[PDB]
Every structure is written in C-alpha cells, then in structure tokens.
Write a protein that binds this ligand. Structure first.
Ligand SMILES: OC[C@H]1O[C@H](O[C@H]2[C@H](O)[C@@H](O)[C@@H](O[C@H]3[C@H](O)[C@@H](O)[C@@H](O[C@H]4[C@H](O)[C@@H](O)[C@@H](O)O[C@@H]4CO)O[C@@H]3CO)O[C@@H]2CO)[C@H](O)[C@@H](O)[C@@H]1O
Length: 585
C-alpha cells in the first residue's frame, strides 16, 4: 500500500468529539488500498500492559482518489491514545501512529486526543437540523406598504429587468402579508438580507444598525413580523453586516467631518486624512474601491462592543439567528466571542457564516454552526446544470467536501442553489426545468439545510446580480405552480422522513456512462435511497441492494415498486427522473 496517501491528525475533522465521552475518528488512504481499518485504543495514562480496545471503522465514503474510514471510539476516560491497523487486498497489514508506519504496534507510535471538554462538543441548535430556509430580498420581495416606497420605484412586473440602482418598494409589511404563502410552501425559517437603515437597494451599507430602514419598516412592524411568522412556525434570521459599515454610519460621518479630531477614527482603516470618497479612497473598503462601505475594525474592542450591542438589541426583538456577511474577513477572535454572546442570550439562536469556500476553520465548534455551502452549489452546478462533470465526479466532489468538516457542521450546512449574488439556477440550467427539478429534488434530499432562493419555487429566472434580484412574480398565471407543488411535496417529505434531516449519507451507486448517481440517507434502521438519472434518455439500472436493509421500498414521489431479487434492484428511470426509495422503517 502507498503510505504517502495515508492520513489522519488528532484534531480538526479527523478527530473530534460528538459527545463528552465518544471520539469520532477518520482516516484517509489511496482508494482500494485498504480493505479493513481498525483502531486500537486505550486511556492516555493506561498501563503498557493493559489491553487495548478495538474499533472497526467502515468506509464512510470515497472520493476521486481516496477512501475515507470512520470510527467511533468510546472514551470513558475522556482521554485517549490510539493506533491504526491497516490491511490490504492481498492481506498485507501495517500499523499507523504518530511516530510513523511500522509492522510492530510499538514503532507505529500512537495518536493522542488529550481530553474531551463538554464545552468543546460541537453543538448546533436542534431546530436547525430539520429546517428549510427561504431567503428573502426585502427590497424585491413584496410591496405591502406603498407609502414605504422610496423615490424612483419602478413598475413591478414580470418583464422587469432590474438595474444596479433599481427600487421596487418591497418592504416588511409585504413579508407579513405573504406569510400565508410561506407556510403553505412549508418553509421553517426566513433569512432576510440586510434590512436596517440604508440608502442603497440591498442595504448592505448600514446607516443605522439600530433602525429598520424606513422604506422597509419600523420597529413596531418588525416586532409584528416576528410575531406573525413565529405563530406560523417560521423562524427569523437577519443579515448581520459586521465587516463593513455604510458611509452614512454615524461614526464614519464623524470621521468625514472632524478628521483626526474624531473619537471614531480608530473604527476604520484609514491611510491619509482628510477622507476622500471621491473615486479613490484613503480608507479600506469592502471589495476594491467601494466608498459606501468603509471596513469596520472588528478587532477594536470598542467597535466590537458596539456590534454586540447591535446584536443584543435586535435579539431582544425575538429573531432566531444570523447569516454573517463577509464573515471570513472579520477576525476569528470577534466571532469566537460572538458565538459566546449570542448563545448566552439564546441557546437556539442560529449562527451562520458566509464563506464562499472551504470554511473548515469556522466549523470546528467554537464559531459557526454552518456556512452557506459554496461547494454544494458548485458541485450541483457542474452536475445538473452545466454537465461539466459526470456522476462519478459528482460523488467524488460531493463526498470529498463532507469529509471536510465535522459531522455536526455538515449536518446543518446551508445548501443553496443560488443567492442574490449569482445567476438563478433555472437560467443556470439554460432554462431546462427538467434538469432544474432534479437539482432541487436532490438539494431537498441531501445532507444539510435546504435554502430556497426567493422566487425559485415559482420558476423565476434571472442572470447574476442584479438580474437575480427581480421582483417576485405574484400573479398565479405567470407562476410555475406545477413546480410550486413539487417543492411542497419535497419539503413535506423532509419533515416526514427523519433520515432526510437527521441521518448520515453514504453513496449508493455511481455510473459515469449512465451519468446516474444515487445515495442513501440513514437514521437508525430507516433507509431512504435516492436515485438520480441525469440523462436526456431513460435507462434502467440495477443497484446492488443487500437483503438486510430491505427488499421492498416505496417511491415516496409516486408509489411502491420493490423489485429486490437475488440481492439487487432493477430500476427503470424516466428521463431526468429521480426516485426516492423509503425502506419502510
Ligand atoms: O457594490 C458592492 C456590492 O455590495 C453588496 O454585496 C454583498 C453581497 O450581496 C453579499 O452576499 C456578500 O458577498 C460577497 C462575499 O462575502 C465575498 O466573499 C465575495 O465573494 C467572492 C468569493 O470569494 C468567491 O467565491 C468568488 O466566486 O467570487 C465572489 C465575488 O462575487 O464577494 C461577494 C459579493 O461581492 O457581501 C457583499 C458586500 O456586502 C451588494 O449586495 C451588491 O449588489 C454590491 O454590488
């Protein structure tokens, strides 16, 4: 076996507690190199004579070139040292420890997970495991209060193609009036884009962190919204913009007027005085040159004290969590203290970070509960939309990521198909709804928290920003209700099938020629297998189905068809059809 591909480290996503007494442990190896992987472990202070415990780690998945093995060590001492025993195809075995590789269990060395602190067991709010979030862009969602409307608001119609500087008058009142809608679709929580006072369309450049923007509403209406959504079983997640403030943020105004005599000069990153927001800048902003968003010095104890208060205030109104704008650009220090705070006020308040890339460092348990899954989005784009990759690559990309973070995180990752910063998935698919549905069908059944982008459920389309911020189509006759009901059913299934929300994922079948991929979600003895035939022609397939998880399954989308004979299941699939098999337990 190629030792150069064997991997594990006693921390991160390869060693982590799922409770105060059990250690989840993972190991990597060249695919097909190791057939059996066992872990020999014992207390860190246990005697050399004492016998070791045994833990058999089956394959939890496999990627483009590696096999991932996963074990669960019962560490009653809450301390543990351990070694790996690896065996190959033709029977060769070898030991793996911190010291290195060896045929002797001694020279292999032993890995060490010092202690397991209860305070360090990664915990996600129970409700987040089985929620289905619906992202709302207020300014472009619903106009329920016309006098809210800001100047230059444009006609609200289907054939409306937004402008970077466009306004449509949608406000919080609009969201309250549409709650009836959301309950029907079945959303569990709403994620609102920034809604505090801001002169912009997106409101990402905050004027007042403590004020609903007038065109969006007022404190009363907000309390009103929270209350009304809650009694409807819908949670509240607001956009927390702590990386940067608006050029109108009171303290920046101070800097813009009193120069160095301002007590707030130290709340931003400024090169040369006086401040010049002309076309260039003498202060650090969001992207490159973006004047309305001077970066905020979150490292400043004072700036931090302020933003937490901003958080306290709004949290006093009953909201349920935060999506953190450009979170990866604010110090972990701030965020670690942040989790400390938020959780202190509400254990179930949800913490969501916005990192469009490997956020493994924030998903260790001390900072975030999840992040919007950048990759899920990409893997789904390449497989369903563009076709840049085949079924087997899908499984690879799909699996490789899962092994990226600790189970607690992956369980809640916000798997979106799109957001306000990208093209809409329908057009992402070249308008092919067929392909589209398969992706939402999958999105709605895979490991993580589904995030519907407002309007997607009605067949709304649009290019990337700002075309993806089109006013929600509210006229039923121009709505894709055919698709709307599709969502209700998939959404419902998620709430009815425990495995789909609290289960693990193991790949079931992957055929590159068929470009057909399937997986199985499991919780206890309940097994739900999802079959995805990504081809414009229908082909039948035979999946390996060992007669122990069942020989009878029901297509929760249509109806029964248990063809398990002599260990396998022959399935004929319609084009771009997906099947969801419930093992009946
Ligand atoms: O004029 C500036 C813009 O300000 C507002 O933009 C928001 C976005 O709507 C938010 O979603 C968010 O997005 C950032 C993101 O945080 C940041 O990492 C960056 O992302 C990269 C990413 O590293 C990478 O995956 C790659 O694919 O490209 C991305 C660039 O698109 O950029 C995102 C968006 O620029 O925060 C910003 C800033 O608050 C406003 O809504 C926009 O309309 C406006 O143009």
């Amino acid at each position: 076996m190629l030792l150069e591909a064997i991997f594990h480290e006693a921390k991160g996503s390869y060693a982590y507690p799922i409770s105060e007494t059990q250690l989840r442990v993972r190991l990597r190896a060249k695919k097909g190199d190791v057939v059996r992987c066992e872990v020999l472990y014992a207390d860190r202070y246990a005697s050399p004579e004492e016998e070791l415990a045994h833990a058999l780690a089956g394959k939890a998945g496999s990627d483009e070139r590696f096999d991932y093995f996963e074990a669960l060590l019962e560490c009653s001492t809450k301390r543990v040292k351990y070694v790996f025993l690896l065996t190959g195809p033709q029977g060769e075995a070898v030991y793996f420890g911190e010291t290195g590789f060896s045929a002797e269990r001694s020279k292999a060395g032993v890995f060490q997970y010092a202690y397991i602190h209860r305070s360090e067991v990664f915990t996600t709010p129970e409700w987040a495991k089985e929620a289905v979030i619906y992202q709302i862009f207020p300014e472009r969602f619903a106009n329920g209060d016309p006098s809210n409307d800001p100047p230059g608001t444009e006609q609200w119609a289907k054939d409306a193609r937004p402008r970077h500087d466009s306004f449509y008058g949608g406000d919080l009142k609009g969201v309250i009036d549409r709650l009836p809608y959301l309950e029907e679709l079945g959303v569990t929580a709403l994620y609102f884009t920034p809604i505090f006072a801001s002169p912009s369309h997106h409101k990402y450049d905050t004027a007042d962190y403590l004020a609903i923007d007038p065109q969006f509403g007022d404190l009363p209406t907000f309390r009103r919204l929270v209350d009304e959504a809650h009694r409807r079983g819908i949670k509240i997640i607001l956009d927390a913009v702590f990386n940067h403030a608006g050029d109108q943020f009171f303290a920046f105004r101070d800097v813009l007027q009193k120069g160095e005599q301002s007590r707030y000069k130290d709340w931003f990153f400024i090169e040369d005085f006086p401040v010049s927001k002309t076309s260039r800048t003498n202060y650090e902003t969001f992207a490159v040159q973006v004047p309305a968003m001077p970066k905020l010095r979150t490292e400043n104890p004072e700036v931090k004290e302020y933003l937490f208060d901003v958080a306290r205030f709004w949290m006093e109104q009953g909201i349920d969590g935060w999506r953190l704008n450009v979170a990866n650009e604010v110090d972990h220090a701030f965020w670690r203290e942040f989790r400390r705070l938020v959780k202190s006020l509400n254990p179930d308040a949800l913490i969501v970070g916005e990192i469009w890339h490997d956020a493994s460092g924030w998903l260790m348990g001390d900072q975030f509960d999840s992040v919007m899954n950048y990759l899920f989005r990409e893997s789904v784009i390449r497989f369903f939309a563009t076709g840049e990759i085949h079924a087997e690559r899908f499984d690879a990309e799909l699996t490789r990521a899962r092994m990226l973070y600790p189970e607690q995180a992956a369980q809640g990752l916000w798997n979106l198909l799109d957001s306000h910063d990208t093209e809409r998935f329908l057009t992402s698919c070249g308008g092919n709804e067929a392909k589209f549905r398969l992706a939402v069908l999958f999105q709605m059944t895979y490991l993580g928290t589904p995030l519907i982008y407002y309007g997607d459920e009605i067949g709304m389309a649009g290019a990337t920003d700002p075309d993806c911020r089109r006013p929600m189509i509210w006229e039923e006759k121009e709505q894709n209700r055919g698709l709307f009901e599709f969502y209700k059913e998939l959404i419902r299934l998620r709430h009815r099938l425990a495995s789909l929300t609290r289960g693990n994922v193991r790949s079931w079948h992957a055929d590159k020629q068929a470009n057909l991929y399937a997986f199985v979600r499991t919780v206890q003895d309940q097994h739900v297998g999802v079959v995805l035939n990504n081809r414009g022609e229908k082909q039948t397939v035979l999946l390996q189905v060992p007669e122990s998880g069942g020989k009878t399954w029901l297509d929760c989308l249509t109806g029964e068809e248990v063809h398990g004979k002599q260990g396998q299941l022959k399935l004929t699939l319609r084009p771009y059809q997906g099947m969801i098999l419930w093992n009946g337990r």
